[PDB]
Amino acid sequence: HPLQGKVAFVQGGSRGIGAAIVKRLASEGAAVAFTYAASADRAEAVASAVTTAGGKVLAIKADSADAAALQQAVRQAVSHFGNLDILVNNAGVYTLGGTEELALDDLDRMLAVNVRSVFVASQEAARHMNDGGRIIHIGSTNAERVPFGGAAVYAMSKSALVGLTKGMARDLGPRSITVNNVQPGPVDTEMNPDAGEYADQLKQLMAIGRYGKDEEIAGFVAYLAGPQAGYITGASLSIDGGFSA
Amino acid sequence: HPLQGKVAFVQGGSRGIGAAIVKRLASEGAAVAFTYAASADRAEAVASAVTTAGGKVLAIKADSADAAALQQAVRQAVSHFGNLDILVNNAGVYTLGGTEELALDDLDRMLAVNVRSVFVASQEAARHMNDGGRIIHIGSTNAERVPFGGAAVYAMSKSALVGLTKGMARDLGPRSITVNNVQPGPVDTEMNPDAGEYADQLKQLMAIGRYGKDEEIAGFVAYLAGPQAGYITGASLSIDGGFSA
Amino acid sequence: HPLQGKVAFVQGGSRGIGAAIVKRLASEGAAVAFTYASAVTTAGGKVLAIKADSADAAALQQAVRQAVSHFGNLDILVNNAGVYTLGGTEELALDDLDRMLAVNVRSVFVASQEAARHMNDGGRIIHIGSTNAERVPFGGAAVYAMSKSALVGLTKGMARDLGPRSITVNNVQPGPVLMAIGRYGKDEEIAGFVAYLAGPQAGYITGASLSIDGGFSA
Amino acid sequence: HPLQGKVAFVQGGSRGIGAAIVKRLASEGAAVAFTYASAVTTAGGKVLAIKADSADAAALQQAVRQAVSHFGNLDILVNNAGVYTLGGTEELALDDLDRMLAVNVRSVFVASQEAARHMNDGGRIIHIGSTNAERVPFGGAAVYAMSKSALVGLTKGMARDLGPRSITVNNVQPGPVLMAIGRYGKDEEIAGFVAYLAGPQAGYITGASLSIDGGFSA
């Protein structure tokens, strides 16, 4: 239980990758607060998974487009569990549109979920974080490799995380808080499933030939959140099957 | 006159780097439309510099925080000069604040000038651009090297350009339009002058030991805008005195 | 014991980071052969120490094959040999150039090739690079940094070659063992990252250059 | 003639990109010596062609010094020698490994060192790398990519060493001469980028790896 006694906050913990992160951090001993945007039933089920197995959980409904909500959610977590040790930012909107076609609203949307709320959650978490803590952003391999049209704003929003990570690492390093950007490739989720033609075409660009699993992302995040990873900071860390080789 | 007959649009052309870009592109033969946010007198003087020397110019007052304004400015340029060949995005806000201290408004501000309006100007320019055109974003070496605290959101906003550039290059490549991100280091301007203690400390991190000059940035932008640079696309191109080595 | 039943080869496993890597892999249940014709081992033990130098391609090849004779095909190779010699561009001796190329670059490929000839599908190759591949703040490091940035291309291309066999290939980039965290790293932290990548949870990480540098390169 | 009065050395200047580089630099007014004990030149001319191979460090050193005897200290060195041999990790012959290391890596440092010994302040060193240092989409390229990603660290560190002399050091990364633009590049486009970096407007560009690849690496 490498995270016994620790308190983690997961922005977007109710489904896919975020649910697996919640469950792995709890399995390792952390008490976990997480936000969900949509489904109370889904969040209830993730919470139960933490509890049936002996872990402590708080689910918080919050819209990641609303900065006030995110700040309120962090404060509510800290009232529930005490100061944070770990923040994982996993809100994320993957929408395609060409440069000449994308609507001004889908843009301003990926900006608010994928960039602005990552900063806002990080700032409020840092204000309530123990020294020796961990902040992990979930970016994308499209920060490094954009093989097709339609991903310009999505890739912009994820490469934003590279400079955020570097500069936050400098800010928070004197507190011994690490800041890292985990860059996944394709991962099998219910809205991006490993199925169909587009999945086959993506697999052809990967050295591994398969989609990643939610639990593999969660295993990397849990390593970075743990006691062996205090020297890892400022980094953009690819876990992408070789997509970006 | 490698740009004879060409039409360029410069977002932020009235001062510093943007004024030097305007003057160099006009000197090479382009007709230049440029936006300015603040000073009609400054913009009038840049316009005169283009004209006294025999070039064609249009100055447009526009707030780079206002997407409608930027779209209107591009349309007004195209009515004045015809379809664009070149877009240079040089709006830019360099504000420092630690992660735990930066105000929600300074953040949402660097986001609007340094990220969102670069996309918005690019989209509207692309809709009115000839094939074989050029789009040049002005990013920063802080996308690659963040040596001190206080630059997290600034560096986020500039590393955003890396993925924008890659994805826009894919979108616009079939039109033979190149898309590049010029990443300057410190440059001697009236608001960031090569003078004082902070300038000396920055120079110590540079291999060159001096600030860059506005005309050196303009020379690189003019090369990238020209007829010898049609193979350069998707790139993030450092011109930083070795800051980021 | 996440590495129970697995077989590892560590090039440069006799002190510092290399010794911490050998210790950690063995503690997780791997058989470990390492370099640092002579060998030492313990009866009933699963750690084999081989003295052979990282300069001669036939020797290094032979050491790999010795390990396979003891233990079977490899699952894990870690390339951790490394020579660090400072010199300005105008002054560096050609013999120092040649030593850094032979140890830091050529021996990495030689060991990787031999390992790949005798490796189970689902294996792991981990190169030990440096954060100097990304940030070179001072003079004197040009050829050292060159030798370490070489591993970035090697990793990418080796990941493409070996991916059809489900073998991952990554480049771990340490910093000192400029800093954002205010201390140097510990050998055991570098070993814990290599052990993670060597294990069963890390099959989707490939082709990557992964920095563990205290924020040196930020 | 932005290079009037300047002296350039081009390692590998006899065909393709190298020949386009020699032509462009000379057209801008430079004296140009290039490699491709024998030499040819024209009476009254400022282009000197030297046959010496990019393998032997004393020879390459000698060619540089020959150029300095004709023309004076250098202002510009362009390293454009290059060997491209495909082979998977498991199969590549060690002699092909060794040839790519000697030509693509070691000869780049040897020429750079000799040039730096005989170079005016305010000079320029330009290495010709490859976009394969950043994107390796297919198998077969591991050692080629390794040899070319080596130049990234070299460039960074050489920029730090030579910056006090105002000498810039950059790495030009071509693509084919995956694509975003839908054609391969022309030799003369690579030469125009090298000429820009070699000129008087480019003194603030240093340490950089600068891609000219049609968007291959995007």
Author numbering:
A (entry chain A), B (entry chain A): 5 to 249
C (entry chain B), D (entry chain B): 5 to 40, 51 to 191, 209 to 249
Direct quotes from the study:
We have previously identified an SDR from Serratia marcescens BCRC 10948 (SmSDR) that was able to convert 1-(3-hydroxyphenyl)-2-(methylamino) ethanone (HPMAE) into (R)-PE. SmSDR is a 3-oxoacyl-acyl-carrier-protein (OACP) reductase of the classical SDR subfamily that catalyzes the reduction of its authentic substrate, OACP, to (3 R)-3-hydroxy-ACP, participating in the fourth step of 16-carbon palmate biosynthesis. Each subunit is intertwined to form an α/β/α-fold barrel, of which the seven-β-stranded central sheet is flanked by six α-helices on either side, showing a nucleotide-binding Rossmann scaffold. Two phenylalanines, Phe98 from the β4–α4 loop (residues 94–107) and Phe202 from the α7 helix, face toward each other, thus constituting a bridge structure over the top of the binding pocket.
The structure of the double-tyrosine-substituted mutant F98YF202Y was solved to 1.47 Å, revealing a clear electron density map of the mutated tyrosines. A close-up view of the region between residues 98 and 202 showed that there is significant conformational alteration: (1) no contacts between residues 98 and 202 in F98AF202L [Cβ(Ala98)–Cδ1(Leu202): 9.81 Å; Cβ(Ala98)−Cδ2(Leu202): 11.39 Å] and in F98LF202L [Cδ1(Leu98)–Cδ2(Leu202): 9.20 Å and Cδ2(Leu98)–Cδ1(Leu202): 9.33 Å]; and (2) an additional H bond between the hydroxyl groups of Y98 and Y202 in F98YF202Y [hydroxyl O(Tyr98)–O(Tyr202): 3.10 Å]. Thus, the replacement of the bulky aromatic chain with a shorter side chain at the region of residue 98 greatly led to the loss of the hydrophobic contacts between two arms. Conversely, F98YF202Y that introduces an additional hydroxyl group on the phenyl side chain creates a strong H bond. As compared with the wild-type enzyme, F98Y and F98YF202Y had an increased thermal shift (2.08 and 1.28 °C). There was a lower Km value for F98Y, F98YF202L and F98YF202Y, indicating an increased binding affinity with substrate. The F98YF202Y mutation that introduces an extra H bond seems to strengthen the conformation rigidity, hence resulting in an increased HPMAE affinity. Yet, a lower kcat value of F98YF202Y implicated that this mutation might restrict subsequent catalytic events possibly due to its inflexibility. Structural comparison indicated relatively low RMSD values among these structures [apo vs. F98AF202L: 0.11 Å (223 Cα atoms); apo vs. F98YF202Y: 0.14 Å (234 Cα atoms); and apo vs. F98LF202L·NADPH: 0.14 Å (226 Cα atoms)].
